[PDB]
Point group: C6
Chain length 136, copies 6
C-alpha cells in the first residue's frame, strides 16, 4: 500500500495522545509560531513540512525515494514547562513505526520558535521515509 | 518535433482534470502564495517555473539538455483537505508521459507554502526533461 | 577585433526582429520587470546583464576569458501567450553566431520575472563567450 | 538515565551563580537581544537554542547522537564590563561536567549581539553532547 | 616600497582621464548606485571596495598577500551609451601597471547596478595585487 | 596565563595611539557605522567582533583553539583621508604581538562601511589567536 500523508500525521498525533493523555494535540491550519492554545493543558501542534523526492535510481520504472518532514511544536507559558514537554515528545516519538514507511521515525532537530503572546514555543523536527511508486 | 512549453503544462492540467473532476484547475498569473480562490471547490494552480539548460557537450552542434520545472499548488481552507489534495496530485501526475520530453514526469518536492487569507497552500514541484536543438 | 558588447546585443535584437516581424523589440533603460508596453504587439526587452572575467591563464600576456550574460524578456498580457512567446525566442536565438565571440550563443535559463501592471513577464537568459585582450 | 534538558540548563545557571555571586543570572522567555535589566549588576540570560540529531549509524536500533546548543548572554551598560564578564563566563563554564552528557561542556563561539536600550550584549554559545536512545 | 592604496586609485583615475577626455571621472564619497550628475556627459565614479589578506604562508615573517578590489561605475542617461562606455573602461584599464603592485590590473566582472534618477549604471570590478609586509 | 580579551583590545588601541598621536582612538559601544565624531581628528573605533573556538583535538582535556576577531574602523569626512588612515592602521597593526596570544596579529580584510552623516568609513578586520584552557 502507498503511504497516505495524513495517516502518517495522525499516527504521530495519536501516539502522542496515548502516551500523554493530558496534552492537547492538534493538527492545525495555523502556524505554531502564533497559534494560541485554549485549553488548560500543555499544547502540541503537529505539522507536515513537506518532502524531497530523489530521482529514480537508473530504473525503467518511475519509483522515487521520499524523505518526509514533520514537526511537533510545544506551546506553553513557562520556559521550563516547554523544555520538559519537549523531552516528552522525543521520548514518545523517536523510533516509532509509521504506516507504509520503510524505517522508523527519526529525530532531526529541535529549535526555538518564539514566545509570541506569552507562550514559549519549541519545535521537534522529524523525518520519515517511504517509496513513491507511480501508476502504470 | 521541438517541445512546446504550453503543450506540456496543458498535458499536466488535463491529466489532473480528468482524474480529479471536483477540482478547479487554473493556469494563472497570480502567485499561488497569495491567490484567493473564488468559490468553495478545491483549487489547484499549475505554474511553469522555468528551465535550466546544460551546456552543449563538446560537440559541433548546439544541442542542450533542458530541465523543466513545473509546480502544482493546492489552495484550500482546511489543512487536512490540503494534504489529501496533495496526495491526489501526486498519484495523478507522477511518472506520466509528456509530449516531446525525454523521460516521464518526475516528482521533485512537496512544500508548505503558507496560510495567506486563511487558505492552506501546498505545492508539488515537478520536473520534465527535453533536448533543445538549435536551428542550422 | 575586440568584442563590442553593444554589437552583440544588437545581433540578438536584429535576429529577433527578422524572425518575429510582429514583435516589438527594445533595448531599453527600464527594467523588464516594470516596463509597460505602449502597444498591443508582443514585447521583448533585451538587456546586458554583465560579464564575469576569468583570470589570465598565467602567461606573459594579459588575456582573460569573458562570459557575457544577456536576457530577453517577453512582456505580454496573458500567461499562455507569454509562454508561447518564450518558445519563439529560444528557437530564434539558440545557437546563433555572435560577432567577435569564440562560440555560438548558448541558452542558460528561463525564469518567471513577474506580472506587474497586468503584463506577464518571462526571461530567457543566454550566454556568449569571448577573449578579452589587454593593450600593451 | 536519559538526559533532562532543563537539568543541563540548571547546571550551567547554578555553576554561574556560585562562581559569580555579583551576577544576576536568568533563564528567561525574553530574547537576550531586547531584555532590559532591572538593576545595576551584570545580567546573564541562559537559553536553550536547540539540538541536532545525527542519523542512527547503520544500526537496527534507533540510537541518535545529539548535539545541544546553549547560550549565555551578558547584558551590561558599558562594553569594557561586558567583555570582562564574557571572560568570566568562559572561565566558569568551559570544560564543565554536565548531567547525563557523554563529554564536558564545550565552547563554540562568542558574538556581539547589539546595544539595545543602551546595554552592550555579547553571547557565549556552547555545546553539550548526549546519546538519544529510542524506547523499543 | 609599501603600496599606498590612494596611489592605486589615482593611477586608475588618471589613466581613465587620459584615454577618455570626454568622460567625467570622480573619486566620490557618494555611492554610484545613487549619485546624480548634473548634465548628461559620461560620468565615472572610482571607488576602493576593500581588500582580502591571505594568511602568512607559515614562515618566519608576517608577509600577507593582498587582493585589492576597485570599482569603476559608468553613470550615463542612455543604456547604449552606458555599454559603449563600459567597453571603453575595460580597454583603458585591463592590464595596466599599478604602483607597488606585483602584477597588472585584472578585470573581475561587469554588473548592472540600476537606473536611478534616469541614469543607467554599470560597474566594472577589477582586482589588483600586492604584498603586505609587516613592520617590526 | 589566560588570555584577557579587553587587554588584547587595549594593546591594539595603545599601539595605535603610540604610532598615530593625531588620531582619536576609541573603544565605543556605538557601531562604527553610525558613530558621529566631534572634532577634526581622524577617529578610529576598535571593536571586539567575537571568537570561534575549535573542538578539543582528540584529547581528554578541554583545550580549545580560539580565533579572535577585532575591527578597527576609520571615520573621516574625506574619502582620500580615510584611505590614507586605513594605510596607517594596517602599517601600525599588522604582525604586532598580543598578550597571551600564540602568534602575531594578522590582517584579515578591509571593507568599505558607508558614508553616514557625511563621514567616510572603512574598517580593517584582524585576527588574533590564542589557546583556551579550561579549569580543572
Ligand atoms: Ca485527554
Ligand atoms: Ca540516471
Ligand atoms: Ca468539474
Ligand atoms: Ca515589424
Ligand atoms: Ca548575588
Ligand atoms: Ca601621462
Ligand atoms: Ca574633458
Ligand atoms: Ca610602549
Ligand atoms: Cl500528559
Ligand atoms: Cl475530484
Ligand atoms: Cl512575429
Ligand atoms: Cl561576581
Ligand atoms: Cl572620451
Ligand atoms: Cl598621527
Amino acid at each position: 500500500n502507498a503511504m497516505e500523508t495524513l495517516s502518517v500525521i495522525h499516527t504521530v498525533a495519536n501516539r502522542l495522545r496515548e502516551l500523554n493523555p493530558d496534552m492537547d494535540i492538534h493538527i492545525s491550519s495555523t502556524d505554531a509560531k502564533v497559534y494560541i492554545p485554549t485549553g488548560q493543558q500543555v499544547t502540541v501542534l503537529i505539522h507536515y513540512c513537506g518532502s524531497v523526492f530523489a530521482e529514480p535510481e537508473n530504473t525503467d520504472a518511475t519509483v522515487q525515494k521520499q524523505l518526509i518532514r514533520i514537526s511537533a511544536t510545544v506551546i506553553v507559558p513557562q520556559i521550563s514547562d516547554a523544555i520538559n514537554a519537549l523531552d516528552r515528545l522525543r521520548r514518545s516519538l523517536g523510533g516509532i513505526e509509521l504506516p507504509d514507511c520503510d524505517r522508523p521515525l527519526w529525530l532531526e532537530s529541535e529549535k526555538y520558535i518564539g514566545d509570541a503572546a506569552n507562550f514559549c514555543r519549541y519545535a521537534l523536527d522529524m523525518t520519515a521515509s517511504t517509496l513513491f511508486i507511480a501508476e502504470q
